[PDB]
Paper text:
The 26S proteasome unfolds and degrades hundreds of proteins to maintain proteostasis, regulate cellular processes and generate peptides with second messenger functions. It consists of a 20S core particle (CP) capped by one or two 19S regulatory particles (RPs) that gate access to the CP proteolytic chamber. The redox-active thioredoxin (TRX)-like protein TXNL1 is expressed in many cell types and was proposed as a nearly stoichiometric component of the human 26S proteasome. It uses its C-terminal PITH (proteasome-interacting TRX) domain for binding, while potentially reducing disulfide bonds with its N-terminal TRX domain but how it binds and is regulated remained unclear.
PSRpt5 showed five subunits engaged with the substrate (Rpt5, Rpt1, Rpt2, Rpt6 and Rpt3) and Rpt4 as the disengaged seam subunit. At the top of the staircase, Rpt5, Rpt1 and Rpt2 are ATP bound, whereas Rpt6, Rpt3 and Rpt4 at the bottom have ADP in their active sites. Although the density for Rpt3 is at lower resolution, we can with reasonable confidence assign ADP-Mg2+ for its active site. The weak density beyond the β-phosphate does not fit a γ-phosphate, Rpt4’s arginine fingers do not interact with this nucleotide and, most importantly, the counterclockwise-next Rpt6 is convincingly occupied with ADP-Mg2+ as well. As there is no solid experimental evidence for nonsequential ATP hydrolysis in an AAA+ motor, an ADP-bound Rpt6 implies that Rpt3 at the bottom of the staircase is also occupied with ADP. Like for the 4D state of the substrate-engaged yeast proteasome, the seam subunit Rpt4 in PSRpt5 is the next subunit to move to the top of the staircase and exchange ADP for ATP. PSRpt5 was clearly the dominant state, with particle numbers ~2 times higher than expected for equal probabilities of states and 4–5 times higher than three of the least populated motor states. The preceding PSRpt5 is the most abundant and likely most long-lived conformation of the hexamer and its transition to PSRpt4 is linked to two ATP hydrolysis events, suggesting that the movement, nucleotide exchange and substrate engagement of Rpt4 are slow steps during substrate processing.
Author numbering:
A (entry chain A): 338 to 420, 426 to 433
B (entry chain M): 5 to 244
C (entry chain J): 2 to 240
D (entry chain L): 4 to 240
E (entry chain H): 3 to 234
F (entry chain F): 353 to 439
G (entry chain I): 4 to 251
H (entry chain K): 5 to 127, 134 to 241
The structure:
């Protein structure tokens, strides 16, 4: 009877998912999760969890116990962007 | 399927499907009838009022092509209005280039050829309206031509177009239009229009009449209210 | 399904045909351009032409006007058309305005022509990227790159074509004010830029050198040999 | 099905689905109410603001001293149609030195809009117009749907959530003719307010009023000019 | 490669303009037509069979003249042959107006082929489903060319087109000699059509025309009758 | 033959499946039937049910026509937003 | 697929229709040209050698464009005729405007521009004709110019277009002596190459056309070799081959 | 949707043109542009989005001089933005020529939207770029935002670009009508630093203001360092 | 075809003249060749042939002797078999052949 | 409907008896189903 | 094979134009049959006049259209396309008369008509007119002439001919009839046409359903037989 569509999360939803999947993470206090949500334009919650996991992995790679915002940026790059002249046309 | 997407593609059995589809669009519209008197032509269409907010005459289907020519469209109203504009342009051009009123046969032929030209190209679609042309002049009498989306047009002694085409035809055959005048035949037209009306599927309608004949000195005009009301009364006298 | 028409936007707002035109540029030989205080240089790799063919007709660096020159990437067929229209444009601009054409103006017109060719169906985008430089600013050296999309940019130093990323990283690493303080050092810098992606001997590096209020000077093989010998001397000194 | 891509294709049922879809595009716009008394033809529109601190969009446009419209649909098509009607009214003023009658202008709009609904090359004009004006035959309220079929209405309402306004106008049809300007505007505001959800209310920042009268030219009331009409309205039950 | 067999302005991955070969196949499914060039003249012969005796044989002629010294024979679609012959006549008259000399057969063939090519370069225009066989007598030497929908033209000494063209070609190079004359060429055309002809060859069923120095003329049914009687 | 319900059929179906629910007299079922082209009887019943739930979501004691239109939207999983180019 | 029309760019950035047009060139008959110190020549193979086919033009593959230019042809016959007619038109237009013969490269550039325009604008298929050019001009003298269906040209000393092009070009590069070839040596090399470039043995003279360009007293006479000299070259190559196998 | 989104001439069953919305999606790929309209003037702050240190920072254009009294902020396709900006300049020059007066921001924005409306109206595709027109006129300082559909509306403080949503929300939280130019610049720079991936400095943004009396001022490097000091 | 799965790609080109002579001598070993048999000329008369065609030539040369009811084959039988086996099919329509100049 | 059937029977509303959770993979439909099973307080049957 | 029948300009693999064949099949949609017979000094055409409605004006249902005074036609097929084709034919005849003086011969007339049909069938712009055109007219030095000429653009002269749904059977009947040489008189020509149509239709041929037009050498004017002459011909035919 009822058909519920699970569309891709919006910016508020993506920020909420980022907060959900980083609550147990050993992160810094200054991480702008809104920026991370905006850097994943069309990404599911599973991709957000993958981004958080990859940020933790990056901060583990170097012997650090806290995942900084740089690690989250690198994780976003590796998860979303990995899988410039094209972006040169847009500004 | 496959051959019905464009108006320029012939079917394997050899029929332009788009024209038939446009015909089916006309059949989906309300009934419009025209009866030729012994001395004129009378038009009557069943104009449904879709919403009560309308203005008792909005989007009327009775169009004056010229002083003597009237059109009683049934079908897609935008296409009908465009075709009325084309017919008016053709009549004006004929009058300007020849000096006299365009004969109904010639006007019907030209407007039909304009209609048929829109079933020849893929970039255009056939007209979704069917219309009938009526006029009177002492030189050539009363004429009534019906043109459908195909572009075919021959004269009619009495014709109907719309949903209840068939019932209007069965009832109009039992009328001796060859000898009756345009006075009582208007009451007859109202009665037939009232017979061909579902009234349980169509909520309401506003009956509008039109005629052209000897009593209207050869001109086409809206039927006067002071006799349209009596035509309506005769229609109510008939139980259906 | 959104990459078969130039005038169709993808759901994420991408004109994929334009990016596919960009992809043709990366399949061309690299062109390196860096501007100095009194010098503008256009490095170009050669494809080591066949033993039985004449190089005179495989010219890749051409001058639009007497003091503006461009090096392209991508297909030569589109590049020749672009260069011809640019020459006609600079001559026409000289006709209407007696001032000589500006490198900025010629770059803008080339970008406009490319944009007009990527604006409707039935017109394939110009799959060439041009490195336009010149002293047309009447005392100021300028360098410009036109993407096949229709956008142009001013670069202190830039590379196009195959291996452009490596040369761009190299130049970003060592394009300094001290590196381009003299013409010889700038030409040497072009040489080191082209050496990494084009590993070969001579005649595989073509350099176009234009001085202030001068004409285009395509360096002969002897000159590039002497410069590469100088670079070898510098690197042996480093070791 | 596969008869849903072009205006020049006919469905087997005898319908043109592109025209029906264009007719739906009116419902994507805000509700607009237009109604006429014996001497005045008022139209009231609800304005949506994209952001809180963005100005409310213009919904009632000026065409001539005796022609005013309220747009409900595509902004591009609405502005194109408004420009066309402004040009036609200017041409009529220049050639005949008389105001263009509302019926003739509406017929011209129907004729112009019909062409995109018949030949390939451009989509139908996906905007519904509530044309109001004065001429020798009295006030007029025309509704021009994108199907190129226009209706002469006593009190029409188009746009999103316009059925409540249409029902209210249907209920109070009789009183409209014998009403002054203030009562006509109040009835239009009530019809518009019937469209709003329970939480929202008729404020001065999202309501525009356009009036054409016997001796009153077209005037568009926005913001504080709406307040004289807005005050005095009975609170919704 | 069925996906590239529709458009005329696209190349197959193998590089074949498929619609041209399709038009050629339509040509080869047409009525037989044979032309032989003799040392003194050129002979054009096509079979003209109606589905019934109900058809006036003399109303439509497959062999038509372009100038006083140029003929036309075809194998394929007649309606396309009519526009082709009209264009050939216009081109010949234009050349005559410009140069005040009867147009050379090679030049006429080249211009006609250029007309044929004009319909093979854009979508929405169909290639001419007919191949022409062009006679001529220029500078005291006979001419014979074939123009294809592809736009290619050659200089056939003697060839057979249309249905069963392979059989006609095999008959040629057997009974064809380079040093024949007009009557032997007419006879060779008669037999070449004969083995590509179903049924009796009546004076109405076969239309021929010689193209010697006196100019091109369509042989009247009497001449065809006596020539056939000599052959039979 | 069981055909897809037409305008009158759809209006009648919505009337039948809204009989048990407190519905405003102002609902125009004819307008609803026009708005639900290519709807089967099950989809019309779902329209009525979803209209009821949309009324219940707002805490409304009685249904409205706009509730029915929103239920029509929700039946086909469509979501309506204020498009920035539709004004 | 991304070959529906020429204007389509592949995701890799390749004009698939253009590449299709070039790959289709190998269907054409073998054409080659050798640049020598004293002149330049062209050599062509007649695919159609039917005895029922009369040879009236004697220039079906090699066309004269200007008083000092000539071109060989390989590709679609209709496109070939169109390009050669346009070549003559451009040549005469330049002659009318400047009153001097075209410097060869300008005319080749004009054709290449036309071909590029055809491969760029929609609704037009690329010209499936690759044609070689020969000519002499006051600026660089004898030149051999190559044209591709995409409009990319290039100066060359010796090439081959058509059937088995790669083998002919490879053996050209193997046994061409730069700056030491005379017109007689160029003719001998062309005959040697055409012998095994085509599968047909004995290199029949009727199946091969050769045209040579010479600079005599400032006249630039274009000569198409008649059957007699072609047969003489064939017998010369046969006797050379017999001498070569004498070592065996 | 795939059968309804292959052209601007096709209507979706919802009535939406599923090609204008893709053009709106295109503007989301550009760098964030922020404009605030205050009584003292209009400020425009954008993100440079530099891709290489060798590129000249002034080469790419995000804020431009439409006229001496109007500045425009860009977000989206470079080519479409350049075409629209040139059209704005030409139209403002035409208005000055014909009427001997500076065009209102309303009128120049309408003129640009007139070109933005012709996306297949038979004299192509929608212009995938959003413009923020800011300037002063006889009505005072004004800010206008235009979208690819040509829909243009006055905005008190509009943010467009990659971070349009978050910057717009913080703008709603931080904007009031009694704001002066200095606090407008400070708040806009703070919001930009909040929504910018890279650390805010003087080379990764350009700031421009238009105040009554003064002309279009684009902040220089020294002025940029001065204003980013306190933030 | 990647190495590790197909380590060596061995190509079988059509036999050359010496290879064709070897195949002819292999497939005519049990045949009663006449004194005037020069199998090298038969190899030369089969340019660009395949090993199966070389064997088919021997088979047809023997079948000619079978037709004539003899157990020996002559050079003429081999020459006629060369023509019967190596008979190709051409375009047969000069129209199609002349599309490409 | 399971926890508070009174909110529906009073208004005569028959609740839907089925849901189709559809969307792109990874959007969280299975997560929502697991959350439903976590607080269903009734018989939850996962069909293999 | 079956995918090539959607565009008129596309050739079938066997070399056929399926759209033209479909247009030919569209001729039978009218459900009518027309037959034309040529006598020694007259040409007679008869055709069905189906009026399946009492309210139709039988005067306006006539399929006999007069191109000119000495040229007549009968149009079988789809009605609107046939009417368009006759208007085109009248225009062509009037233009020929204006441009060359003497009246257009029948063969030339619908040879021009067939040329129009052929250019329609070559360039894919409009669908071919699904209507067969049968022409008559007395021409000097050649006697009576009747030419049938079709949507494909194929025109021919006929001693007798017919087109419509019942075409093959009528042509077979005429083959059986036009093999016995006899005086093809006006009376005999009309009688044989009526017998052809009646036998192929197996209908008693009430005079109200057949309409006949004939041109004669004695009276070279297209004349449509009214009810009285048609009935007289039928009764002379029966006895
Ligand atoms: N909205 C969300 N909020 C939080 N986490 C989410 C959300 N959506 C997905 N996730 C995370 O993504 C993971 C995988 O998602 P899930 O298993 O629900 O996928 P699904 O939508 O059912 O897709 P599939 O089509 O593969 O079945 C979950 O375990 C959860 O951690
Ligand atoms: Mg799951």
């Amino acid at each position: 009877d009822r058909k519920i569509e699970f569309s891709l999360p919006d910016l508020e939803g993506r920020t909420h998912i980022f907060k959900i999947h980083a609550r147990s993470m050993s992160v810094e206090r200054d991480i702008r999760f809104e920026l991370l949500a905006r850097l994943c334009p069309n990404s599911t919650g599973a991709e957000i969890r993958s981004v958080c996991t990859e940020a933790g992995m990056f901060a583990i790679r170097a012997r650090r116990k806290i995942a900084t915002e740089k690690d989250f940026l690198e994780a976003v790059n590796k998860v979303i962007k990995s899988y410039t002249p094209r972006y040169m046309t847009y500004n | 399927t496959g051959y019905d997407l464009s108006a320029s593609t012939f079917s394997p059995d050899g029929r332009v499907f788009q024209v038939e589809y446009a015909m089916k669009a006309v059949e989906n519209s309300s009934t419009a009838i025209g009866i030729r008197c012994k001395d004129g032509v009378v038009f009557g269409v069943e104009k449904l009022v879709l919403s009560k907010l309308y203005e008792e005459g909005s989007n009327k289907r009775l169009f004056n092509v010229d002083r003597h020519v009237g059109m009683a469209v049934a079908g897609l109203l935008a296409d009908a209005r465009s075709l009325a504009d084309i017919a008016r342009e053709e009549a004006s051009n004929f009058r300007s280039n020849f000096g006299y009123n365009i004969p109904l046969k010639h006007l019907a032929d030209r407007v039909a050829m304009y209609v048929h030209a829109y079933t020849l190209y893929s970039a255009v679609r056939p007209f979704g309206c069917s219309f009938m042309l009526g006029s009177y002049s002492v030189n050539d009498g009363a004429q009534l031509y019906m043109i459908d989306p195909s572009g075919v047009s021959y004269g009619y002694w009495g014709c109907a177009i719309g949903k209840a085409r068939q019932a209007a035809k069965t009832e109009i055959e039992k009328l001796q239009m060859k000898e009756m005048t345009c006075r009582d035949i208007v009451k007859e037209v109202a009665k037939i229009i009232y017979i061909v009306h579902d009234e349980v599927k169509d909520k309401a309608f506003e009956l509008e009449l039109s005629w052209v004949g000897e009593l209207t000195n050869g001109r086409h005009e809206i039927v006067p209210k002071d006799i349209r009301e009596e035509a309506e009364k005769y229609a109510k006298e008939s139980l259906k | 399904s959104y990459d078969r028409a130039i005038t169709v936007f993808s759901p994420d707002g991408h004109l994929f045909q334009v990016e596919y035109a960009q992809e043709a540029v990366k399949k061309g030989s690299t062109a390196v351009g860096v501007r100095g205080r009194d010098i503008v240089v256009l490095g170009v790799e050669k494809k080591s032409v066949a033993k039985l063919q004449d190089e005179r007709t495989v010219r890749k660096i051409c001058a639009l006007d007497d003091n503006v020159c461009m090096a392209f990437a991508g297909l030569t067929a589109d590049a020749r058309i672009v260069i011809n229209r640019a020459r006609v444009e600079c001559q026409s601009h000289r006709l209407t305005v007696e001032d000589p054409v500006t490198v900025e103006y010629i770059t803008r017109y080339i970008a406009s022509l490319k944009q007009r060719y990527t604006q409707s169906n039935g017109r394939r985008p110009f799959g060439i990227s041009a490195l336009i430089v010149g002293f047309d600013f009447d005392g100021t050296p300028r360098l410009y790159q036109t993407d096949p999309s229709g956008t142009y940019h001013a670069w202190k130093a830039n590379a196009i074509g195959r291996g452009a990323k490596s040369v761009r990283e190299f130049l970003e690493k060592n394009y300094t004010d001290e590196a381009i303080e003299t013409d010889d050092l700038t030409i040497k810098l072009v040489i080191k830029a082209l050496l990494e992606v084009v590993q070969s001997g001579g005649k595989n590096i073509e350099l176009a050198v234009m001085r202030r209020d001068q004409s285009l000077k395509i360096l002969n093989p002897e000159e590039i040999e002497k410069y590469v010998v100088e670079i070898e001397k510098e690197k042996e000194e480093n070791e | 099905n596969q008869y849903d891509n072009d205006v020049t294709v006919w469905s087997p049922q005898g319908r043109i689905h592109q025209i029906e879809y264009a007719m739906e595009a009116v419902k994507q716009g805000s509700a607009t109410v237009g109604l006429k008394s014996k001497t005045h033809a008022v139209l009231v529109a609800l304005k949506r603001a994209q952001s809180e601190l963005a100005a409310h969009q213009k919904k009632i446009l000026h065409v001539d001293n005796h022609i005013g419209i309220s747009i409900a649909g595509l902004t591009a098509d609405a502005r194109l149609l408004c420009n066309f009607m402004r040009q036609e009214c200017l041409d009529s003023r220049f050639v005949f030195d008389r105001p263009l009658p509302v019926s003739r202008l509406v017929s011209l709009i129907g004729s112009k809009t019909q062409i995109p609904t018949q030949r390939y090359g451009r989509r139908p004009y996906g905007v519904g117009l509530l044309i109001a004006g004065y001429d020798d035959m009295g006030p007029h309220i025309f509704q021009t749907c994108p199907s190129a079929n226009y209706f002469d209405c006593r009190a029409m309402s188009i746009g999103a959530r316009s059925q409540s306004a249409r029902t209210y106008l249907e209920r109070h049809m009789s009183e409209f003719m014998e009403c002054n300007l203030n009562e006509l505007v109040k009835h239009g505001l009530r019809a518009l307010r019937e469209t709003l959800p329970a939480e929202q209310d008729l404020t001065t920042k999202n309501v525009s009023i356009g009036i054409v009268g016997k001796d009153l030219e077209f005037t568009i009331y926005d913001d504080d000019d709406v307040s004289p009409f807005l005050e005095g309205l009975e609170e919704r039950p | 490669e069925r996906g590239y067999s529709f458009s005329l302005t696209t190349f197959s991955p193998s590089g074949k303009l498929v619609q041209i070969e399709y038009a050629l196949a339509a040509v080869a499914g047409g009525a037989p037509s044979v032309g032989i060039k003799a040392a003194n003249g050129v002979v054009l012969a096509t079979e003209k069979k109606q589905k019934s005796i109900l058809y006036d044989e003399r109303s439509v002629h497959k062999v038509e003249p372009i100038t006083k010294h140029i003929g036309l024979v075809y194998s394929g679609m007649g309606p396309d042959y009519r526009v082709l012959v009209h264009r050939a006549r216009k081109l010949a008259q234009q050349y005559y107006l410009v140069y005040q000399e009867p147009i050379p057969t090679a030049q006429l063939v080249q211009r006609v082929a250029s007309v044929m090519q004009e319909y093979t370069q854009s979508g929405g225009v169909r290639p001419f489903g007919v191949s022409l066989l062009i006679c001529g007598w220029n500078e005291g030497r006979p001419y014979l060319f074939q123009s294809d929908p592809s736009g290619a033209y050659f200089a056939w000494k003697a060839t057979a087109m249309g249905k069963n063209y392979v059989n006609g070609k095999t008959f040629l190079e057997k009974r064809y000699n380079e040093d024949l004359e007009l009557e032997d060429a007419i006879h060779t055309a008669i037999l070449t059509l004969k083995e590509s002809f179903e049924g009796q060859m009546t004076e109405d069923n076969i239309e021929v025309g010689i193209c010697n120095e006196a100019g091109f003329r369509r042989l009247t049914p009497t001449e065809v009758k006596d020539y056939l009687a000599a052959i039979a | 033959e069981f055909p897809m319900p037409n305008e009158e059929a759809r209006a009648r179906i919505m009337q039948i499946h809204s009989r048990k629910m407190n519905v405003s007299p102002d609902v125009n079922y004819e307008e609803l039937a026009r708005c639900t082209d290519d709807f089967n009887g099950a989809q019309c019943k779902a329209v009525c049910v979803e209209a009821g739930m949309i009324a219940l979501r707002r805490g409304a004691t009685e249904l409205t026509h706009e509730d029915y239109m929103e239920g029509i939207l929700e039946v086909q999983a469509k979501k309506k937003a204020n498009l920035q180019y539709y004004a | 697929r991304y070959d529906s029309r020429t204007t389509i760019f592949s995701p890799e950035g390749r004009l698939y229709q253009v590449e299709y047009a070039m790959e289709a060139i190998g269907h054409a008959g073998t054409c080659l040209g050798i640049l020598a110190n004293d002149g330049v020549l062209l050599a062509a193979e007649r695919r159609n050698i039917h005895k029922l086919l009369d040879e009236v033009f004697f220039s079906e593959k090699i066309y004269k464009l200007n008083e000092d230019m000539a071109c060989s042809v390989a590709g679609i016959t209709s496109d070939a005729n169109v390009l050669t007619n346009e070549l003559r038109l451009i040549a005469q237009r330049y002659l009318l405007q400047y009153q001097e013969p075209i410097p060869c490269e300008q005319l080749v550039t004009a054709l290449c521009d036309i071909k590029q325009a055809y491969t760029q604008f929609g609704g037009k298929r690329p010209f499936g004709v690759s044609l070689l050019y020969i000519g002499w001009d006051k600026h660089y003298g004898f030149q051999l110019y190559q044209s591709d269906p995409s409009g990319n040209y290039g100066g060359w000393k010796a090439t081959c277009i058509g059937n088995n092009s790669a083998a002919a070009v490879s053996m050209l590069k193997q046994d061409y002596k730069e700056g030491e070839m005379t017109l007689k040596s160029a003719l001998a090399l062309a005959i040697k190459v055409l012998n095994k470039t085509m599968d047909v043995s004995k290199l029949s003279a009727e199946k091969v056309e050769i045209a040579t360009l010479t600079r005599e007293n400032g006249k630039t006479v274009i000569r198409v070799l008649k059957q007699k000299e072609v047969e003489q070259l064939i017998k010369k190559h046969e006797e050379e081959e017999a001498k070569a196998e004498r070592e065996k | 949707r795939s059968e309804y989104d292959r052209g601007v001439n096709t209507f979706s069953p919802e009535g939406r043109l599923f090609q204008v919305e893709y053009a709106i999606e295109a503007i989301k790929l550009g760098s964030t542009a922020i404009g605030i309209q205050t009584s003292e003037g209009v400020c425009l702050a954008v993100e440079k989005r530099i891709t290489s240190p060798l590129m000249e920072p002034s080469s790419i254009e995000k804020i431009v001089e439409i006229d001496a009294h109007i500045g425009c902020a860009m977000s989206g396709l470079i080519k479409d933005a350049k075409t629209l900006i040139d059209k704005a300049r030409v139209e403002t020059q035409n208005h000055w020529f014909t009427y001997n007066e500076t065009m209102t921001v309303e009128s120049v924005t309408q003129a640009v939207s007139n070109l933005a409306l012709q996306f297949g109206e038979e004299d192509s595709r929608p212009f995938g770029v959003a413009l923020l027109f800011g300037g002063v006129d006889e009505k005072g300082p004004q800010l206008f935002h235009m979208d690819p559909s040509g829909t243009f509306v006055q905005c008190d403080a509009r943010a467009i670009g990659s971070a349009s949503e978050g910057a717009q929300s913080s703008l709603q939280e931080v904007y009031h009508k009694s704001m002066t130019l200095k606090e407008a610049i400070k708040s806009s720079l703070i919001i930009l630093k909040q929504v910018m991936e890279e650390k805010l400095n003087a080379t990764n943004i350009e700031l421009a203001t238009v105040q009554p009396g003064q002309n279009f001022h684009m902040f220089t490097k020294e002025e940029l360092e001065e204003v980013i000091k306190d933030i | 075809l990647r190495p590790g799965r197909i380590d060596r790609k061995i190509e079988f080109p059509p036999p050359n003249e010496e290879a064709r002579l070897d195949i002819l001598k292999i497939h005519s070993r049990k045949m009663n060749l006449t004194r005037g048999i020069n199998l090298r000329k038969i190899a030369e008369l089969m340019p660009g042939a395949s090993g199966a065609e070389v064997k088919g030539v021997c088979t047809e040369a023997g079948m000619y002797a079978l037709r004539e009811r003899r157990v020996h084959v002559t050079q003429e039988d081999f020459e006629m078999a060369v023509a019967k086996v190596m008979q190709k099919d051409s375009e047969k329509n000069m129209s199609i052949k002349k599309l490409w100049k | 409907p399971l926890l508070h059937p009174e909110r529906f029977v009073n208004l005569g509303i028959e609740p839907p008896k089925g849901v189709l959770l559809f969307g792109p993979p990874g959007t969280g439909k299975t997560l929502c189903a697991r959350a439903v099973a976590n607080r269903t307080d009734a018989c939850f049957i996962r069909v293999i | 094979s079956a995918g090539f029948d959607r565009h008129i300009t596309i050739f079938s693999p066997e070399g056929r134009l399926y759209q033209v064949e479909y247009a030919f099949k569209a001729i039978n949609q009218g459900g009518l049959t027309s037959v034309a017979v040529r006598g020694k000094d007259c040409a007679v055409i008869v055709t069905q006049k189906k009026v399946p409605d009492k309210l139709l004006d039988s005067s306006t249902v006539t399929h006999l259209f007069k191109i000119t005074e000495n040229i007549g036609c009968v149009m079988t097929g789809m009605t609107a396309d046939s009417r368009s084709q006759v208007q085109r034919a009248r225009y062509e005849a009037a233009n020929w008369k204006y441009k060359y003086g003497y009246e257009i011969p029948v063969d030339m007339l619908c040879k021009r008509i067939a040329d129009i049909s052929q250019v329609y069938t070559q360039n894919a712009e409009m669908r071919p007119l699904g209507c067969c055109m049968i022409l008559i007219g007395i021409d000097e030095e050649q006697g009576p002439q009747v030419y049938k000429c079709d949507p494909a653009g194929y025109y021919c002269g006929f001693k007798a001919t017919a087109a419509g749904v019942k075409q093959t059977e009528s042509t077979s009947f005429l083959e059986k009839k036009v093999k016995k040489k006899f005086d093809w008189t006006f009376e005999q020509t009309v009688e044989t046409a009526i017998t052809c149509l009646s036998t192929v239709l197996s209908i008693d041929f009430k005079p109200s359903e057949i309409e006949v037009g004939v041109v004669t050498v004695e009276n070279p004017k297209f004349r449509i037989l009214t009810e009285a002459e048609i009935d007289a011909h039928l009764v002379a035919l029966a006895e």
